[PDB]
Structures are given as C-alpha cells and as structure tokens.
Design a protein around this ligand. Structure first.
Ligand SMILES: OC[C@H]1O[C@@](CO)(OC[C@H]2O[C@@](CO)(OC[C@H]3O[C@@](CO)(OC[C@H]4O[C@](O)(CO)[C@@H](O)[C@@H]4O)[C@@H](O)[C@@H]3O)[C@@H](O)[C@@H]2O)[C@@H](O)[C@@H]1O
Ligand code: ZN
Ligand code: ZN
Length: 495
C-alpha cells in the first residue's frame, strides 16, 4: 500500500458480484422473477473457450435475490444431439404458468449445418415444476416460414402475460429481408396464434434479445443491436403499446431521448430485464478480451460472452431510462480505505482533501484492492472541459486505460492512454449544466461499471485494475476533485 508500481494481477482470485461460473463464461442471460420462490432466476447460455462443434451453449442458471449474491444452479437445459434441431441452444425466455404450475422456458434451437429444406432456427420449449428438472417438449417446433417469416433468423423469444391473461411471445426474425419482431398469442402457452408483426426493426438493423415491459406509465422495448458499428443495448418507449410500436413504423425513428436510446456501451450486451415489484433490473454480459489485453476490443465485434452484470433501471419523470447500480451491490463494499496521493504531475495543487488539476496534470492514488467502490466529485471550469479516470496506472506504467469524460462532446470514451494511445469506444450521456460530476465506480476484479449523475452507465473490462493504482487527470481546461473515497470487499485485517 506504500508503493505505486504496476503489479501483474490476475482474475484467478475469483469473481463475486459480476458472476462467472468456475468453468467457461456467461453468454446471453435470460432473467426471470420466480413468483413462488420470490427471487430472480437468471438462465444463461454457457460459453466455453473453445466450444464443441454442433452442440454448444446449453442453458445454465444462477439464482439471486438482489443482483449481488449468486447461487449457481448448474446445467438446466442441455443441448440436443448433434443432428437435432436444438444441437445448439440460443436465447429465449421463461414464464410461470399458474394454471398448471409449470415454468416454461422457450428457446432457440439452432440446427447444425441445415439443409435447404431445414430451418437453421426454430423456437422450442422445455418445462419444469421446480426449476431443477427440465423436460423438453418433443412435439413443439415453431417455424418462422409457417407464418411468413424467416427460415433461418427466428430467435430470442420473449414471453410476457398481459393483465387480461393473454400470453404473448415476441420473436426476432425477418420478413421480405427486413427485420421484424413477430408476435404470437396463446391462452395456455401450448397453442399459439400469429398476431402478425409487433414492430419492425429500423432500416437494416437487427434487434437481438428483445424485451417488452411496462414500468409506471410507459411501455418499453429493450434490445441489443446486432449491427457491428453499434453492439449496444438500446430502447424505445411509448405511453401506450400502440405508441411504442409506432416508434419504428415506416422507419419513423422516434428515439426515446437525445442518445438514440443507448443505455450502455460496447462492453455490456444482450441485456434483458426482470422486476421483483420494487425494482426492475437489467442483466447483460461484459465481454472478455483476447489475450486479456484491454486494448483489443475486437476488429468488428468484441468477443462473445464474459461476466454477468446486473444494473438497475432508473425511470425519469419524462419516461426516459438510465441505468444505476443495484442497491445490494452498493453494500458489498464495506470498509472505507485510506486515500493517499502517491504521485503528482503537471500543473496542479493539493488543497487539503480537494485537488485542482489544470490541463495536462495527473494525480495517482494508492493501490486499489480486488473488489472496489470508488467515489468522488469533479467540478469542471467550463462545459467544454475534458478529464480522465485512469486504471492500471502504476508510476512505471508505459500505458494505461482511461474513461475520458469529454463535456464538449457530450460523451465518455474508453481509451488506451500513454504509449500506443488509442480511442476504443464511447458512451453518450447528458452533461450537467452546473459542471458537477458525481462519479461512482464499482469493480469486481477485471469488470467495472462507472456511473455519473444517474445519467452515465459505462461497463468496461479492465484487466488488472485490481491491486494497481488509479488516477485522475485533466486533458482540457481545469477540474476540482472533491470527496474522494474508496471502499473494498476484503477488509478482514485485525489491528
Ligand atoms: O459459431 C459458433 C460460435 O459463435 C459464437 C459467438 O462467437 O456463438 C454464436 C452463436 O450462438 C448462437 C446459439 O447459441 O446464438 C446465441 C445468441 O446470441 C445472440 C445475441 O448475443 O446473437 C447471435 C449472434 O451473435 C452473433 O455473433 C453476432 O454477430 C451472430 O453470429 C450471431 O448471429 C442471440 O441472438 C443468439 O440467440 C448462434 O446463433 C450463434 O451463431 C460462439 O460462441 C460459437 O462458438
Ligand atoms: Zn476476504
Ligand atoms: Zn475477493
């Protein structure tokens, strides 16, 4: 704690709040509020590095009351045989049927090397009375082309029941080349009728992992954009279901806010929600990086799967959504640590427990631990200033990794700083009029989420942020840093 040199830390210690199974990684999650157990069941596609040919992504599960503590459920729905329709499983959705007291999980069966007459993707279902033993329904095969949709893109079923008792299933597919979310209705979850297109997908986009829900006086669609330049979780909103569906009708592009509904950036994907009646949370995954290299974020798309991340939905008075930390996660960080300056550079002053940094100045703080909570307040002199939050920055580090907050650009960027500096990706968010940024960062080994002013929610993979110093800097203008605090998970030091 008295040195600030770079240390080659690892993820082997283990994750807690941003869950990873002992073997493999967390792919698309399928969260569900279990109304009998009164907790969340998060099914997810289990990823291995490498996966088998043909038979991959079985559905595993974890249980959580709150998004911070997880109990593994192991393998719940296994892959089919190499030649079967669900040789590989894709994402779906779970729902409880009070009439027969069965949990139903609809999923995507991906056929290995389909023939011209076969369907690459078909929706299938499994049921369970207790969420431990699941029985595949060997007679249920929902094919898109039966209803005018696509034979090979027909996936990610989302199930919900409306107040009138009707069950709805939304499926991401195509019709005449264009992306369509198709709707099916049922009284009993067994016999399904097509209700046509729920919503079309903007332009040539494709909305994976759709999720529709009502929260307060607004209806929402949350989705994950497949297009390579986006790869982010986004949403639309409407006061009525018809208003929601109209946001994309005829490519209207009625964005819900001033940032095209982009909730997070490229290190949080496949996000879907569930509510316990008090809060609605969103679960997605944070990708791994090839070679554990924080600056290798994929040439086209990032690696698929990684760690499970939960965030809380914040509904604003105008109906827009931002994401915040789940309250139970904010409580895993218990012992406040001492914050000490280990190095200063450039044009800056230390004034007690505040710091003023001019253009080009940096301050480096003492080493973080393994699971961290970092909080501070930044006041900039102008609404065009720029400052940085840097990790893995040892006094001897040639390069490091930073969240750049660019007020003149209306966004935060994740970048590599120092030698071989390079921009990686960004995250638009509302800039405060009073130039005050209340920052909180929650980390679990290599996974962290940065929150600012209940407006920015920025997940990042930062290998080796643990057990290494962190830093604040000013790139443009002048900033004053206040109320710096750091709290930790491990804290069991008898003194
Ligand atoms: O080729 C197999 C090989 O590819 C990976 C990703 O590198 O898995 C992709 C395949 O998984 C499948 C079935 O499990 O889909 C899973 C779900 O993923 C979703 C959203 O995350 O989208 C699939 C979509 O992901 C891409 O990688 C995006 O470009 C596409 O390849 C693909 O269309 C969701 O919509 C799916 O349900 C299967 O469909 C994918 O091809 C590896 O893990 C795997 O080993
Ligand atoms: Zn401990
Ligand atoms: Zn630990």
């Amino acid at each position: 704690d008295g040195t600030a040199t770079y240390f080659q830390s690892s993820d082997e210690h283990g994750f807690s709040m941003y869950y990873k199974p002992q073997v493999g990684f967390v792919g698309d999650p399928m969260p569900f509020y279990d109304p009998v157990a009164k907790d969340f069941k998060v099914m997810y596609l289990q990823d291995y590095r490498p996966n088998p040919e043909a038979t991959y992504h079985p559905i595993f599960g974890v249980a959580t009351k709150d998004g911070a503590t997880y109990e593994s459920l192991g393998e719940l729905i296994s892959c089919g045989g190499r030649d079967e329709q669900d040789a590989a499983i894709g994402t779906g959705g779970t729902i409880y049927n009070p009439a027969d007291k069965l949990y139903y999980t609809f999923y995507t069966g991906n056929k290995f090397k389909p023939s011209s007459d076969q369907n690459a993707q078909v929706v299938m279902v499994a049921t369970s009375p207790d969420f431990k033993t699941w029985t595949k329904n060997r007679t249920f095969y929902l094919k898109g082309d039966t209803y005018g949709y696509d034979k090979n893109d027909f996936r990610d079923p989302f199930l919900f029941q409306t107040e009138d008792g009707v069950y709805h299933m939304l499926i991401a597919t195509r019709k005449n080349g264009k992306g369509h979310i198709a709707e099916f209705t049922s009284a009993d979850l067994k016999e399904w009728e097509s209700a046509g297109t729920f919503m079309t997908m903007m332009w040539d986009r494709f909305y994976a992992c759709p999720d529709v829900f009502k929260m307060g006086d607004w209806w929402y669609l949350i989705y994950s954009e497949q297009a390579s330049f986006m790869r982010k979780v986004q949403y639309f909103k409407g006061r009525t279901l018809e208003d929601l569906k109209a946001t994309t009708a005829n490519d209207a592009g009625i964005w819900p806010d001033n940032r095209e509904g982009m909730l997070d950036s490229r290190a949080f994907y496949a996000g879907k929600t569930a509510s316990d009646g008090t809060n609605r949370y969103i679960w997605g995954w944070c990708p791994t990086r090839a070679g554990n290299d924080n600056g290798n974020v994929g040439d086209v798309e990032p690696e698929w799967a990684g760690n499970l991340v939960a965030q809380r939905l914040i509904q604003h008075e105008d109906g827009t959504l931002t994401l915040g930390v789940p309250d139970a996660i904010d409580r895993k960080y218990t012992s406040a640590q001492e914050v000490k300056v280990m190095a200063k550079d450039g044009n800056m002053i230390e004034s007690g427990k505040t710091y003023t940094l001019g253009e080009g100045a940096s301050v480096i703080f003492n080493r973080l631990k393994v699971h961290n909570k970092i909080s501070f307040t930044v006041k900039t002199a102008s609404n065009t200033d720029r400052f940085g939050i840097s990790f893995v920055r040892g006094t001897d580090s040639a390069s490091w990794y930073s969240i750049h907050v660019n007020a003149d650009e209306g966004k935060a960027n994740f970048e590599k700083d120092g030698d071989d500096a390079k921009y990686l990706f960004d995250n638009k968010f509302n800039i405060p009029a009073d130039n005050e940024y209340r920052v909180t960062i929650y980390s679990d080994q290599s996974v962290c989420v940065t929150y600012i002013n209940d407006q920015l929610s920025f997940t990042n993979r930062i290998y080796q942020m643990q057990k290494n110093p962190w830093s604040l800097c000013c790139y443009k203008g002048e900033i004053t840093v206040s109320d710096v605090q750091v709290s930790t998970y491990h804290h069991h030091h008898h003194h």
